[PDB]
């Protein structure tokens, strides 16, 4: 663009290419996500248009801010606030070793942003460390809404092919075609565990089957009484019954009993039982914060 000077290419766009840039008029540093419109990758503008539609309606300190959208050349440019790094890179920077106060701050900010999305009837559906941006002020922002969607209108189904595998909840792994805000809450629990240990995925499954096994191996396999509809899900198949007795103490060593309790409320297999973002923010984990 004429108003913006490109500084560096810094970005694994989720669907396009991200650049660090300077607004020539105000001297402010921003991030530009550029999208070719004379495509050869036919469907990209579609995701970008959806992200623009949603981000226009999602203005909160903990959601990445879309400032403007430009259309020039054969290019769509989204102008975003600039953030120095994502959580994935941040883990590499600190040897995966966060102070427990920063673990708490990061989870709190994630939940505030996520709670805001859910209260506005938007599911993120791709919550993972690379989609979490962090400032040098220590501010965390949910980003990359290209898989997100508004929810509420009567629909026959949603896609079960949502959420990066390692962050996908068991109901969706079992092919549930209807899910609610609970989908993101599971992913938040996964991120929480990485924050509270050494910044490595809790459940790095190789495929859907391995994914479910890793989850149940740690948390226990749900019984019919805990999750009556489980066996009725479209891609259900019988899993071993792993005991619900396995301690998480060493899985999340940065956490006290209070933190472990919140973690378990996020990582409930039955989506109906999963804590909401609003409820999580009222959890005693955040009381002295």
């Amino acid at each position: 663009m004429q108003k913006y000077e490109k500084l560096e290419k810094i970005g694994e766009g989720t669907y396009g290419t991200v650049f660090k840039a300077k607004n020539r008029e105000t001297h402010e540093i921003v991030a530009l996500k550029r999208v070719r419109l004379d495509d050869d990758d036919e469907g990209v503008p579609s995701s970008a248009l959806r992200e623009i539609c949603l981000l226009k309606e999602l203005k909160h300190k903990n959601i990445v801010r879309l400032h403007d959208v430009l259309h020039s050349d054969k290019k769509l440019t989204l102008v975003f606030e600039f953030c120095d790094q994502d959580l994935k890179k941040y883990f590499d920077s600190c040897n995966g070793d966060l102070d427990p106060e920063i673990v708490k701050s990061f989870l709190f900010q994630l939940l505030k942003g996520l709670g805001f999305c859910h209260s506005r009837n938007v599911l993120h559906r791709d919550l993972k460390p690379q989609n979490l941006l962090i400032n040098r002020n220590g501010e965390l922002k949910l980003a990359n809404f290209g898989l997100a969607r508004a929810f509420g209108i009567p629909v026959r189904c949603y896609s079960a092919e949502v959420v990066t595998l390692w962050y996908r909840p068991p109901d969706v792994l079992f092919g549930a075609k209807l899910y609610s805000t609970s989908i993101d809450m599971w992913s938040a629990g996964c991120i929480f565990a990485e924050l509270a240990n050494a910044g490595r995925p809790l459940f790095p499954g190789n495929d859907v089957d391995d994914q479910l096994k890793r989850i149940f191996r740690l948390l226990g396999t749900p019984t019919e009484e805990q999750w009556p509809s489980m066996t009725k899900l479209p891609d259900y198949k019988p899993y071993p019954m792993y005991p619900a007795t396995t301690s998480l103490v060493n899985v999340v060593p940065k956490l006290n009993a209070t933190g472990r309790d919140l973690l378990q409320n996020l990582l409930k297999c039955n989506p109906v039982q999963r804590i909401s973002a609003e409820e999580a923010l009222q959890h005693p984990y955040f009381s002295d914060f």
């Binding site: 539609c53 769509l76 969607r149 629909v155």
Partner: protein, 149 residues
């Protein structure tokens, strides 16, 4: 009055009434254009099921009522604007990650298409979310569409 075919006919009758300059427009014309796009996406492998359902037609009508000018000057222009609204509907409400431009493009000037998308989004982004968030609003739109016949 709940079936897709009936609601689509309601939308077609609405567009004919809205676009008073289009003397030779048939109420089935918009239905043909919409169904054609949906069939093409299915056959070509872009989606496994059709997008055109009662709820999505209501969503589309909500866009059309605010975006489509009574002053549209040709059937071609109506098709281009309608298909822009349809493309935004697939993009926003569809179950696939993305959809190709080709089936929605009937104009030579691609830049006009993209400018139209952005203009519609600037106008409608709030209502696009509100129709999902507010069941009463969705009901109002649905009732309005029904009463278009």
């Amino acid at each position: 009055q709940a079936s897709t075919s009936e609601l689509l006919r309601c939308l077609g009758e609405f567009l004919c009434r809205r676009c008073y300059r289009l003397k030779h427009l048939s109420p089935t014309d918009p239905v043909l254009w919409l169904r054609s796009v949906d069939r093409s996406l299915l056959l070509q492998g872009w989606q496994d099921q059709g997008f055109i359902t009662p709820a999505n037609v209501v969503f589309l009508y909500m866009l059309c009522r605010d975006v489509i000018s009574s002053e549209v000057g040709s059937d071609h222009e109506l098709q281009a604007v309608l298909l822009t609204c349809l493309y935004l509907s697939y993009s926003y409400m569809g179950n696939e990650i993305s959809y190709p431009l080709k089936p929605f493009l009937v104009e030579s000037c691609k830049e006009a298409f993209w400018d139209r998308c952005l203009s519609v989004i600037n106008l409608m982004s709030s209502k696009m979310l509100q129709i999902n968030a507010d069941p009463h609003y969705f009901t109002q739109v649905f009732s309005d569409l029904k009463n278009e016949s």
